[PDB]
C-alpha cells in the first residue's frame, strides 16, 4: 500500500540548499572557487582554489570523499559520486586532480584523474578507473570499472579504446584549457555579492500573511 503523509512539503520556499551537510561531513568550498547556484554538494566534498562547478552538477560524497583540484572544472549536469570500495582494492575516493577539465554531462564514480587531463563531454568513468596524466578522452567515452587510460594518449569509444598518442603541443594545451575555463568562471563569480536579497522577499511574503 502507498500511504502518503499530509505534511510532506510540496513547495519549499527556500529551494534546494546548495550545501548539504551529513553529520559532521561538511562540504568545503574555497573562497576563490565558483560554484553555480543550483549545484548540490553533499557530504565529503572539497572544492579547491580556482576550481569551478557549473549549473546542474551534483557532487555527492556520502560513501567516500570527493575532491576537485586546483584550477579544475566540473561542467554542467555532471554527476560525481563515490563508493565504499573499488574492485581494484585501491581506495575508492573520487580524485579530480589539478588542471583537469571534466566535460559537461559526464558521470564519475570512484575514479582517479591525474593532473592535466581533459574528459570529453557525455563521458562515463566507472569504479576504480584511472586516467593517467596528460591524457584526453573523446566525447561519449565509456571507461569500464578498473580500466586505465595510459599517460600521453587519446582514447575514445563505448567502450574506450586507444586512438593515437598525443603530441607535446597538445599536452601543453591542456592546462591552458583549464586556465581559460577558470578565467570564464571569474565572470560568473563577479555577478554574486556575498549575500542575496531573497530574505527581503521572504519577509514581505510573511508580512502579507500576518
Amino acid at each position: 500500500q502507498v500511504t502518503p503523509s499530509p505534511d510532506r512539503v510540496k513547495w519549499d520556499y527556500r529551494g534546494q540548499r546548495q550545501i548539504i551537510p551529513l553529520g559532521q561531513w561538511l562540504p568545503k568550498v574555497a573562497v576563490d572557487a565558483y560554484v553555480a547556484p543550483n549545484v548540490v554538494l553533499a557530504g565529503q566534498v572539497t572544492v579547491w582554489d580556482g576550481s569551478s562547478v557549473w549549473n546542474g552538477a551534483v557532487l555527492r560524497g556520502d560513501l567516500n570523499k570527493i575532491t576537485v583540484g586546483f584550477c579544475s572544472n566540473v561542467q554542467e549536469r555532471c554527476v560525481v559520486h563515490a563508493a565504499w570500495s573499488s574492485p581494484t582494492g585501491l581506495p575508492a575516493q573520487t580524485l579530480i586532480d589539478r588542471y583537469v577539465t571534466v566535460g559537461a554531462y559526464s558521470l564519475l564514480r570512484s575514479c582517479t584523474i591525474e593532473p592535466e587531463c581533459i574528459i570529453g563531454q557525455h563521458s562515463i568513468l566507472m569504479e576504480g578507473s584511472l586516467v593517467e596524466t596528460r591524457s584526453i578522452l573523446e566525447a561519449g567515452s565509456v571507461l569500464p570499472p578498473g580500466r586505465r587510460i595510459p599517460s600521453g594518449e587519446l582514447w575514445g569509444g563505448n567502450p574506450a579504446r586507444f586512438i593515437r598518442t598525443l603530441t607535446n603541443e597538445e599536452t601543453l594545451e591542456i592546462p591552458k584549457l583549464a586556465v581559460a575555463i577558470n578565467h570564464l568562471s571569474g565572470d560568473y563569480f563577479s555577478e554574486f555579492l556575498p549575500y542575496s536579497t531573497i530574505y527581503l522577499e521572504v519577509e514581505k511574503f510573511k508580512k502579507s500573511l500576518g
Binding site: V31, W48, D49, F70, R98
Partner: protein, 249 residues
C-alpha cells in the same frame, strides 16, 4: 635553533624579537655606560664574526623553514653586534637601526609562517608551486627573503651597508672579507626559497588555506615598510641618533 623549532610557532615568533630588544637595552646600559673597555668590545667582535660564519653555514644546511629562520637570526645578531663592537655614536645608532629593521622583517616572516602553519608547513620544499596557488603571497614572501639577503633598495640593505661602513671605519678588513663571503652565502640560501616558490614544478602540490585578516593586514603594512622605507628613512635615523646620544647625555 632547537628551542625555536620545538616551541609552538607563536612562541618562536615572540622569542625571536622582544628579548633581543630588552637584552640589547641592558647591554648598552651596562657596558657602553660602564667601563672595562677594549676587552669587552673584542668579546663582541669575535662573537660577531663567529655568529656570522656559523649562521651562514648552518642556515645553508637547513631543509626546514623554522631552523633556517633561527640560524638567520643568529647571523643577523652577529651583524648587529659589529655595531656595539666599534664603540662609536654611529655604532650604537646602527645597532638600533638593525634591531628595528630585523624585528619588522622577522614579524613579516613569522606572519607568513603562521599563515602557512594552518596547512602544517614544515619543509622548504613544501612551498613548491606557491607562485601558482597564491601569487601575491609568493611575491610578499620573496620581498621578505630579498630583504633578509640585504638586496637594495629593500630595508634589509641598511645592515649590510653599516657592516661594511664599520669595517672601513674601525679599520677591519678581515671583517669586511667575512661580511662579503657570509652575505653571498646568505643570499644563496634566501633565494633558494624564491626558487622553490617560483621555478620548481613538483609532482605533488600543497594547497594552503588563506590567512586571517589580522595577519593579512600586518603583512601588508610590513611589506610596504620593507619596500618603501628607504624612500623616507628620516624618522628612524633621527630617533636612533637621539637614543644613542641619550645613553650619555
Amino acid at each position: 635553533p632547537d628551542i625555536y623549532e620545538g616551541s609552538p610557532t607563536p612562541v618562536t615568533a615572540f622569542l625571536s624579537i622582544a628579548p633581543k630588544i630588552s637584552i640589547f637595552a641592558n647591554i648598552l646600559r651596562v657596558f657602553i655606560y660602564g667601563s672595562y673597555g677594549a676587552t669587552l668590545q673584542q668579546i663582541f667582535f669575535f662573537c660577531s664574526i663567529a655568529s656570522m660564519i656559523l649562521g651562514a653555514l648552518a642556515a645553508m644546511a637547513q631543509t626546514k623553514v623554522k631552523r633556517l629562520l633561527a640560524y638567520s637570526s643568529i647571523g643577523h645578531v652577529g651583524y648587529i653586534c659589529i655595531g656595539f663592537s666599534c664603540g662609536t655614536i654611529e655604532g650604537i645608532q646602527s645597532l638600533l637601526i638593525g634591531i628595528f629593521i630585523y624585528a619588522l622583517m622577522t614579524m613579516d616572516a613569522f606572519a607568513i609562517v603562521l599563515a602557512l602553519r594552518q596547512t602544517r608547513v614544515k619543509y622548504i620544499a613544501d612551498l613548491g608551486a606557491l607562485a601558482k596557488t597564491n601569487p601575491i603571497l609568493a611575491i610578499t614572501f620573496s620581498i621578505t627573503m630579498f630583504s633578509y639577503a640585504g638586496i637594495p633598495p629593500l630595508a634589509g640593505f641598511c645592515s649590510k651597508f653599516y657592516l661594511f661602513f664599520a669595517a672601513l671605519g674601525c679599520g677591519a678588513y678581515f671583517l669586511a672579507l667575512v661580511g662579503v663571503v657570509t652575505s653571498v652565502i646568505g643570499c644563496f640560501y634566501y633565494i633558494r626559497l624564491v626558487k622553490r616558490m617560483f621555478f620548481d614544478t613538483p609532482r605533488t602540490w600543497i594547497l594552503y588555506e588563506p590567512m586571517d585578516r589580522n595577519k593579512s593586514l600586518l603583512l601588508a603594512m610590513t611589506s610596504f615598510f620593507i619596500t618603501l622605507f628607504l624612500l623616507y628613512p628620516s624618522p628612524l635615523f633621527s630617533v636612533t641618533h637621539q637614543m644613542a646620544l641619550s645613553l650619555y647625555l
